[PDB]
Design an enzyme around this catalytic site. Structure first.
Site, mmCIF file in Angstrom:
data_model
loop_
_atom_site.group_PDB
_atom_site.id
_atom_site.type_symbol
_atom_site.label_atom_id
_atom_site.label_comp_id
_atom_site.label_asym_id
_atom_site.label_seq_id
_atom_site.Cartn_x
_atom_site.Cartn_y
_atom_site.Cartn_z
ATOM 1 N N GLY A 1 3.193 5.867 9.879
ATOM 2 C CA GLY A 1 4.537 5.741 9.371
ATOM 3 C C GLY A 1 5.285 4.517 9.852
ATOM 4 C CG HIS B 1 -0.461 -0.034 2.541
ATOM 5 N ND1 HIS B 1 0.112 1.062 3.152
ATOM 6 C CD2 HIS B 1 -0.463 -1.020 3.469
ATOM 7 C CE1 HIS B 1 0.482 0.739 4.380
ATOM 8 N NE2 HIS B 1 0.135 -0.517 4.601
ATOM 9 C CB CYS C 1 3.102 0.759 7.321
ATOM 10 S SG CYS C 1 1.447 0.863 8.052
HETATM 11 C C1 LIG Z 1 1.078 2.629 8.183
HETATM 12 O O1 LIG Z 1 2.287 3.238 8.651
HETATM 13 C C2 LIG Z 1 -0.113 2.890 9.115
HETATM 14 C C3 LIG Z 1 0.098 2.356 10.529
HETATM 15 C C4 LIG Z 1 -1.166 2.572 11.358
HETATM 16 C C5 LIG Z 1 -1.330 4.041 11.738
HETATM 17 C C6 LIG Z 1 -1.490 4.067 13.257
HETATM 18 N N1 LIG Z 1 -1.313 2.692 13.681
HETATM 19 C C7 LIG Z 1 -1.078 1.859 12.672
HETATM 20 O O2 LIG Z 1 -0.823 0.669 12.767
HETATM 21 N N2 LIG Z 1 -1.280 2.231 8.558
HETATM 22 C C8 LIG Z 1 -1.938 2.714 7.503
HETATM 23 O O3 LIG Z 1 -1.953 3.902 7.211
HETATM 24 C C9 LIG Z 1 -2.701 1.718 6.674
HETATM 25 C C10 LIG Z 1 -2.825 2.278 5.251
HETATM 26 C C11 LIG Z 1 -3.526 1.391 4.231
HETATM 27 C C12 LIG Z 1 -3.496 1.745 2.882
HETATM 28 C C13 LIG Z 1 -4.131 0.976 1.911
HETATM 29 C C14 LIG Z 1 -4.802 -0.174 2.293
HETATM 30 C C15 LIG Z 1 -4.840 -0.540 3.633
HETATM 31 C C16 LIG Z 1 -4.205 0.236 4.597
HETATM 32 N N3 LIG Z 1 -3.991 1.424 7.279
HETATM 33 C C17 LIG Z 1 -4.270 1.602 8.570
HETATM 34 O O4 LIG Z 1 -3.599 1.166 9.492
HETATM 35 O O5 LIG Z 1 -5.451 2.381 8.882
HETATM 36 C C18 LIG Z 1 -5.880 2.520 10.230
HETATM 37 C C19 LIG Z 1 -7.324 2.102 10.249
HETATM 38 C C20 LIG Z 1 -8.010 2.026 11.450
HETATM 39 C C21 LIG Z 1 -9.338 1.633 11.425
HETATM 40 C C22 LIG Z 1 -9.985 1.323 10.236
HETATM 41 C C23 LIG Z 1 -9.295 1.404 9.038
HETATM 42 C C24 LIG Z 1 -7.962 1.792 9.049
#
Ligand SMILES: *[C@H](O)[C@H](C[C@@H]1CCNC1=O)NC(=O)[C@H](Cc1ccccc1)NC(=O)OCc1ccccc1
Ligand SMILES: *[C@H](O)[C@H](C[C@@H]1CCNC1=O)NC(=O)[C@H](Cc1ccccc1)NC(=O)OCc1ccccc1
EC number: 3.4.19.12
Lengths: 306, 306
Positions: free
Chosen positions: B143, B41, B145
């Site tokens: 960040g 992603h 991830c």
């Molecule tokens: C990536 O660094 C980040 C880490 C999250 C943020 C705070 N805690 C974490 O573990 N995660 C994301 O931004 C991903 C992005 C993504 C993009 C495309 C497809 C799937 C995921 N998603 C995420 O963790 O979103 C948080 C969330 C919470 C509740 C419902 C949906 C999404």
């Protein structure tokens, strides 16, 4: 989100760990520049421990009696001296992996990471606090002596702890890197009193703010209190007195959450007087006190190093 | 003595962390040999997340759209491909710091260390368990991830986890290093059910043996039980069924302490039915389940690495 007891990345410290042998005793040493630091009881035999005269014992040693192993490299020892309870071995080669570093003497209630080592090789890393009574509750087996505690600030490793012994109560005691014990302890195999420990109140409050930040907020009450009234509760429950300096340190967390410090004290008062009733806070059924306010800020702002 | 939740020394993994940028999104990558691994992603915008067609999104990217930062070195990207939910970027330089390594898919109930990272730089390290429901209870901010979980066996780093997302419940989900999610999760910003979690019974028993080894033994009762009778108690309290394979794994700890496994099960039964009555075990007021039997043996035998 989420909140975990997190240790510093240990790679900078790993490259400094060496094996020190003198006679039958082998323990860990810390190799920085052209000096190796280790507990002075490396020169003690079995009989020596109960009543060591370190000066007399050290005089029977010369440079070639100290065997220093860095993985499989020998350092030649070209000088030695005793500084308080540490030995400093001058070697002929500077550690090519010496990080930016400082020696610091930490205050009770502060936290640091321990890199547990055996025979000069790292085994594991965990975070802990210098208790108000200057012990630590670690995990140290035979041969772990000379393992170090540390903090990192960007690129600078601040060494604050070297492990020396386990007390008969099973808690742990050691020195700063100038060899001065934390607490009243001596490097003698005698029974030694740690004295009453107390809970680090400002750390418990920081952790309560951590909990609010992470959605756990059942404990927030509809009361407030005063410093003198809260502190009355603290002494009954063996919590260290809360000062205005502590209140100031909690300021950023107060501003982030919108919860006055004294409002959080009133929640902690009711937690102390009525228990937790089988609930949990950040996954623990006890009031946690090994997170400083800076630990909390750093964890939920994601500060990095190297 | 003493028992702590201990992470592996992280230095071998630190040298593998890089920063991966594609468009506005920056996250962590893992640099081994001439390949960089990261969550796919990284190619998603903000709108893309709810319903990403990863194939179509990836086709709009070429090698030069992926910016890879190792501290301050550029890797030139000379190829890219998608493997399940990970992207593999071929770079022109092999990581000079590549440890001996393997990719492993761990089983639920196993433990590993997480090196939390932001912008390619390590922030902290902690130990945790793959829950029976294939989530982890971590500490991951925006960040984080692409941060990885791992175990070390002497000189070999076994990578088992890459972080992808936080579920709306605040628990964490991710993949092995071939990009297959643990659990039923997909990399889509939709609400996703983790399903019922259970407590890792064999880990709780290992921790009870750890406690006995370290002097905490009030919970040892004058009862025994059977597997079928204990398992009846386990299902009422959402503990995973105890098998004979589990009993066999606990053997060395049984032999060390002289306590039959079923005798320890009877103690755990009475703990589950009657609570802990405000006492503690190894400093916790809850039954801990993120130590495997091997974690326990390793901690009180002092196994080292590098
Ligand atoms: C990536 O660094 C980040 C880490 C999250 C943020 C705070 N805690 C974490 O573990 N995660 C994301 O931004 C991903 C992005 C993504 C993009 C495309 C497809 C799937 C995921 N998603 C995420 O963790 O979103 C948080 C969330 C919470 C509740 C419902 C949906 C999404
Ligand atoms: C050093 O590696 C070792 C670490 C101990 C063993 C298990 N847990 C630990 O923290 N400690 C020692 O062997 C030192 C040796 C020593 C030598 C000369 C003067 C002082 C100390 N002492 C020690 O920790 O002994 C354990 C102990 C327990 C109860 C009463 C006395 C000593």
């Amino acid at each position: 989100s989420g909140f975990r007891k997190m240790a510093f990345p240990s790679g900078k410290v790993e490259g400094c760990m060496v094996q020190v042998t003198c006679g039958t005793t082998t323990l860990n040493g810390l190799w920085l520049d052209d000096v190796v630091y280790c507990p002075r009881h490396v020169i003690c035999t079995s009989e020596d421990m109960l009543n060591p005269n370190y000066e007399d014992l050290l005089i029977r040693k010369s440079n070639h009696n100290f065997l220093v192993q860095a993985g499989n490299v020998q350092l030649r020892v070209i000088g030695h001296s005793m500084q308080n309870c540490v030995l400093k071995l001058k070697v002929d080669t500077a550690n090519p992996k010496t990080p930016k570093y400082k020696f610091v003497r930490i205050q009770p209630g502060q936290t640091f990471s321990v890199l547990a080592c055996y025979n000069g090789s790292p085994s594991g890393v965990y975070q802990c606090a210098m208790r108000p009574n200057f012990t630590i509750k670690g995990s140290f087996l035979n041969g772990s002596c000379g393992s170090v505690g540390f903090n990192i600030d960007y690129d600078c490793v601040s060494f604050c702890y070297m492990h020396h012994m386990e007390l008969p109560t099973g808690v742990h005691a050691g020195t700063d890197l100038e060899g001065n014990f934390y607490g009243p302890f001596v490097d003698r195999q005698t029974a030694q009193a740690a004295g009453t420990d107390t809970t680090i109140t400002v750390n418990v409050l920081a952790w309560l703010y951590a909990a609010v930040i992470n959605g756990d907020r059942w404990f927030l009450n509809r009361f407030t209190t005063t410093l003198n009234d809260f502190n009355l509760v603290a002494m009954k429950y063996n919590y260290e007195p809360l000062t205005q300096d502590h209140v100031d340190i909690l300021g950023p967390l107060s501003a982030q959450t919108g919860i006055a410090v004294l409002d959080m004290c009133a929640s902690l008062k009711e937690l102390l007087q009525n228990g937790m009733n089988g609930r949990t806070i950040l996954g623990s059924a006890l009031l946690e006190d090994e997170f400083t306010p800076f630990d909390v800020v750093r964890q939920c702002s994601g500060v990095t190093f190297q």
